[PDB]
């Protein structure tokens, strides 16, 4: 069943119906505005980092912003989360700057409104949400204000029609496609049953730089609970991959399909997973005809997160196998202290500063120790160990996790 | 209580009043010249009765109507007495619908003839039309109202302000020390000093006036040249002598008082001869309960200000579902044989009163539309009908639901058409 997935290529059907020349796009995904709102330390993280993304777009003078979904963490965001998102979009996206993008294709393009002066149009697809969910989303609200362009709507999970937004700047032509989040198993089934219809403009067939935006699992435990890369039509040149939190901004080239996949990652860690450790970035994609150049930009406002894997039997400072309750503590405490120094150094690197009295100090970092304690060693209560770093770490819970080798 | 309500009328001009140092196009968007025209309304309660199969879209249609009349009649601004939303946390549909109506009816190329003299973060534009990136044709001004929904520092009104669609004024950070500062607006020779007090728990506000903890600020320039307008959202009357705002408490320098919160349409206004102001209670644009006060046909108004004078034009709302109520005292009826098995007689009379109320409701609707009942014309929506029946004196009743079910597809409230009670 996993073997079958590699063999299946170009699924669904393709129908044909009706830097002045460099398209600059700020690419990001998953800001999860509102996540960890009630946390005393982490409460304002999502608001600050979502603002940063829009701030970089304005400072760097990009033509547009493209997001891979999950602007909000919840289906029903709090009044604070909604207010903060709207405030950031209004202050960073409105202005006298002319929009050099020409459209060739309340609901109509925002930067096309005569009553709204949009300097940098935001384009986003709908993402996945785990809180309890009518026919009105928080993304529909962002669209109605004229601040975000909601594209890639999936009204029916059965028959999905993928139509493009056609944009031109000088000689460079962009055919922007999107598929809003669909339950992975459902989407997988739609591609297998040939229920996904891609629409291409008849004119300038080979002229349009084809960009697809998705919000799905890139991998899964079950062979039907993710979207295989081979399923995606080979006429595409670039794929922006949302939903997946790990920053893989450098990208991966698929040699068969002939298209690059860029998984930018979230702008906030939503769990203490290994995937969340990779420093967060956004990117500037510079399209110029057929080729492009992607510039990775490190996020300055994201709280550092260091994870360390420890094997006790390998620690020459600890004696085995006795009551080393004291040995394990001293050693483990020093590893947290080492992880904090690594986190602080990672933060100053992102800022371009040095640790001195005149400079701003780093925020409390997220620290996780995965400790193998086999044959044998004395362990602590994980919560009791985590209480030791009360004003040194952002995570009051889960500083340590003890495990035995399987 | 009686002695305390009496003392309320004896007291006047509560608090403290001091002075503070301060077509035409005043909008900054970049891509009756002496008469300030204001569309006045209150309490649209967007989202109320959302889940009702018949009444679900009433609040959205009527809130749109108010903004639609403002645009059609070419007013300078919209002034609301609070409660744009029914809930503290409105649904996604309610918020979407309010924003859609505001964007379509208030944005446009129409020049704003109102000059902002002084507005006594902010990273955002406090005043709407002064934003160079938003083309505001008709600025909306509103105060915060009361909500019975659980309040889980950010309001839905703050969200409307942040989009640049509504100007939230008359904020009340502290209940103890309330400072009432004006928004100063000029059109030709006409000078408007606009004041607001967002809803405060009635008992708490009453105490603030008594403890002289309410400070009113007046512009030194043009002292007796401003037309003073106050916007409130409080109970105009109450059972307890401390649970409402007495008119006498409000400073007499005011010329006009827009009274929000109260749902009954009393758009004609009342003149207070001592305080020398006119109080206008416009009423809600939707019935929130089947109360006697909700029966009076709904209106909005156009307040025309020239110098220190005003003319108010009453406008009937066409989209509001008709509501007829009848109070029936069974002992005051005949021929109803009392203290006998009179179920048939009681029912026969009550059915005829519902039929009478339906005919009255339909006639009230056609009147609001300016049409006659003919095949080419639109038919009225299902009306709200309520019978409050006193059955004291020996009278047989019927289950309210079974009685209401006799009029299926004839009334909007198919569950509670009748209410049987005994006089206390
Ligand atoms: Mn996600
Ligand atoms: Mn009310």
From Swiss-Prot, chain B:
Keyword terms: Chromosome, DNA damage, DNA repair, Endonuclease, Exonuclease, Hydrolase, Manganese, Meiosis, Metal-binding, Nuclease, Nucleus, Telomere
Keyword Nuclease found: yes
Subcellular location: Nucleus; Chromosome, Telomere; Chromosome
EC number, UniProt record: 3.1.-.-
A GO molecular function held by the record: single-stranded DNA 3'-5' DNA exonuclease activity
UniProt binding sites for Mn(2+) 1: 43, 45, 83, 263
Cofactor: Mn(2+)
Keyword Nucleus applies: yes
GO biological processes: DNA double-strand break processing; double-strand break repair; double-strand break repair involved in meiotic recombination; double-strand break repair via homologous recombination; double-strand break repair via nonhomologous end joining; meiotic DNA double-strand break formation; mitochondrial double-strand break repair via homologous recombination; mitotic G2 DNA damage checkpoint signaling
GO cellular component: chromosome, telomeric repeat region; Mre11 complex; site of double-strand break
Primary location group: nucleus
Binding locations of Mn(2+) 2: 83, 146, 233, 261
Active-site residue numbers: 147 (proton donor)
Superkingdom of the organism of origin: Eukaryota
Family: Belongs to the MRE11/RAD32 family.
Function of the protein: Core component of the MRN complex, which plays a central role in double-strand break (DSB) repair, DNA recombination, maintenance of telomere integrity and meiosis. The MRN complex is involved in the repair of DNA double-strand breaks (DSBs) via homologous recombination (HR), an error-free mechanism which primarily occurs during S and G2 phases. The complex (1) mediates the end resection of damaged DNA, which generates proper single-stranded DNA, a key initial steps in HR, and is (2) required for the recruitment of other repair factors and efficient activation of ATM and ATR upon DNA damage.
Subunit field text: Forms a multisubunit endonuclease complex, MRN, together with nbn and rad50.
Protein name: Double-strand break repair protein rad32
Lineage of the organism: Eukaryota, Fungi, Dikarya, Ascomycota, Taphrinomycotina
Whole sequence portion shown: 15 to 413 of 649
């Amino acid at each position: 069943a996993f073997e079958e997935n590699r063999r299946l290529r170009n699924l669904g059907s393709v129908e044909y119906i009706r830097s002045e020349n460099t398209i600059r796009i700020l690419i990001s995904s998953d800001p999860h505005v509102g996540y960890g709102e009630k946390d005393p330390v982490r409460g304002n993280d999502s608001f600050v980092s979502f603002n940063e993304i829009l701030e970089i777009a304005r400072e760097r003078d990009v033509d547009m912003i493209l997001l891979g979904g999950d602007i909000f963490h919840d289906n029903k965001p709090s009044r604070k989360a909604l207010y903060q998102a709207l405030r950031s979009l209004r202050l960073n996206c409105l202005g006298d700057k002319p929009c050099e993008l020409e459209l060739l294709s309340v609901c109509n393009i925002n930067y096309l409104d005569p009553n709204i002066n949009v300097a940098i149009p935001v384009f986003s697809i709908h993402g996945n949400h785990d809180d309890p969910s009518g026919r009105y989303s928080a993304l529909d609200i962002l669209q109605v204000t004229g601040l975000v362009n909601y594209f890639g709507r999936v009204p029916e999970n059965d028959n999905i029609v993928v139509s493009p937004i056609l944009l031109q700047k000088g000689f460079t032509k962009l055919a922007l496609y999107g598929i809003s989040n669909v339950r992975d198993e459902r989407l997988y089934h739609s591609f297998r049953e040939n229920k996904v219809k891609f629409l291409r403009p008849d004119l300038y067939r080979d002229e349009w730089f084809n960009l697809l935006t998705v919000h799905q699992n890139h991998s899964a435990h079950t062979p039907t609970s993710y979207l295989p890369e081979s399923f995606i039509q080979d006429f595409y040149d670039f794929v922006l991959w949302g939903h997946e939190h790990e920053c893989l901004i450098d990208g991966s080239y698929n040699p068969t399909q002939k298209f690059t996949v860029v998984q930018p990652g979230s702008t906030i860690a939503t769990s203490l997973s290994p995937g969340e450790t990779a420093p967060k970035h956004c990117g500037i994609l510079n399209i110029t005809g057929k080729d492009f150049h992607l510039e990775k930009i490190r996020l300055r406002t994201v709280r550092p997160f260091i994870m360390k894997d420890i094997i006790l039997s390998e620690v020459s400072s600890i004696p085995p196998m006795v009551e080393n309750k004291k040995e394990v503590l001293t050693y483990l405490i020093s590893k947290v202290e080492e992880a904090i120094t690594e986190a602080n150094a990672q933060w100053y690197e992102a800022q371009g500063t040095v640790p001195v009295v005149e400079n701003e100090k780093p925020p409390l970092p997220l620290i996780r120790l995965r400790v193998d304690y086999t044959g044998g060693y004395q362990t602590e209560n994980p919560q009791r160990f985590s209480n030791r770093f009360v004003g040194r770490v952002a995570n009051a819970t889960d500083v340590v996790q003890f495990y035995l080798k399987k």
